[model samples]
Target: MKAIFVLNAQHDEAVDANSLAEAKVLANRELDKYGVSDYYKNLINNAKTVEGVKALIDEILAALP
Candidate 1:
């Protein structure tokens, strides 16, 4: 007889930051690296609130895969 094994893994796909300013810095670098559209780039760069940053992040992620 033979025995089989399987494993599953999960992780939180999230960004952590103590403030919106900090989060924007990290998100900007990623946007630059990925060469995101200018519209999104501007949106992220000009984001004043954390919600705006989150929205842009979602847009960027959706545009990827």
Candidate 2:
């Protein structure tokens, strides 16, 4: 008998300044891109701390699908 081994993993980050920058960069570069709206980008960009950034990320994720 053999047990199935789990082996999937990925990079994770503690939300911070880099998180905000990445969100802004990816959102801007999306193929649908800025034409989508200044909505989420403005919210994500204005987040100035780890707490604020993390909270916004949670909210955005909740809003998706």
Candidate 3:
């Protein structure tokens, strides 16, 4: 698994994991609509602010399985 932080264009952080299960949990929310997409999951996990976190949750609820 891999991860990245979008704090800023020049300061973005990079992340990776030996296990991709966490990524899968975050991604599975949209499995039916997008079919195993991890982009949104990664975005949520890397969110930098409280509002961003809420927005991510809202997005997840809007796309519930």
Candidate 4:
């Protein structure tokens, strides 16, 4: 299984499982930890395709200060 790492200022959050479900949980945890909006978290969690995830990532990045 491949690992996915999501990094922010404080720490690096990792998902070491090979499933989208695990990735979503880890991503949501990181977002919540960083005070990201619940709407953003829900969009990520409910994403049904890889492109949808990419779009949300872009949305988040574009909103970053």
Candidate 5:
């Protein structure tokens, strides 16, 4: 089994400087837990910037198994 994950760190910037990093770390942790780290990395690298990251995330979330 496999899955894609996306996290938007834009709004979190106002809440904390480490929001993006933390979100990413958390995502990695979750992916690791599910044994889906490779899938997550492939999707994340395709994301160009923050907005692109959010968009990719939305795309992934919208697409489910």
Candidate 6:
């Protein structure tokens, strides 16, 4: 599996893993850590590509947070 990234909105951080499931968990963990909305969690949960995940995370780090 290629590297999938779980970007953190709190800081300039990225967690790298080999699976989408892991990415989702990691992403949700950060979301929960920061008390973000569940709607964004679902966005990462269903992301189909690394770019897709990156886009949402990027949005979070850029604007949502």
Q: What's the lDDT for all of these models?
A: 0.72, 0.57, 0.55, 0.70, 0.59, 0.74
Question: All candidates: CA RMSD in angstroms?
Answer: 10.7, 9.5, 11.4, 10.9, 13.4, 11.4
Error of 4 at 43 (Å): 1.1
lDDT minimum window of 10 residues, candidate 1: 7-16
Candidate number with greatest lDDT: 6
lDDT of 5 at 27: 52
How many clashes in each structure?
A: 0, 0, 1, 0, 0, 0
The residue pairs found clashing in candidate 5 are none
- Least accurate 10 contiguous residues by lDDT in model 3: 11-20
Estimate, for each residue in 1-65, the C-alpha lDDT of model 2 and write its tens digit.
Answer: 39865643235565455665875566445524425466766665665655665666566656767
What does candidate 3's lDDT look like per residue over 1-65, in tens digits? 27776554354434334123444455446544665456666665666554555566677668776
Tens digit of per-residue lDDT, candidate 4, span 1-65:
38765754344335433357766776778688889779988888787865666666777777788
Rank the models by lDDT, top first.
Answer: 6, 1, 4, 5, 2, 3
TM-scores for candidates 1 onward, in order: 0.53, 0.38, 0.32, 0.53, 0.41, 0.60
- Model 5 root mean square deviation, Cα atoms: 13.4
Looking at model 4, report the run of 10 residues with the lowest lDDT sum: 9-18
Instruction: After the best TM-score superposition of candidate 1, give how far the Cα of residue 25 lies from its true spot, in angstroms.
Output: 0.8
**Mind sharing the TM-score for model 1?**
0.53
**Candidate 1 lDDT, 18-56, residue by residue in tens:** 456677878878888888666776777688787888887
64: Cα error in model 1, Å: 3.2
Clashes of 6: 0
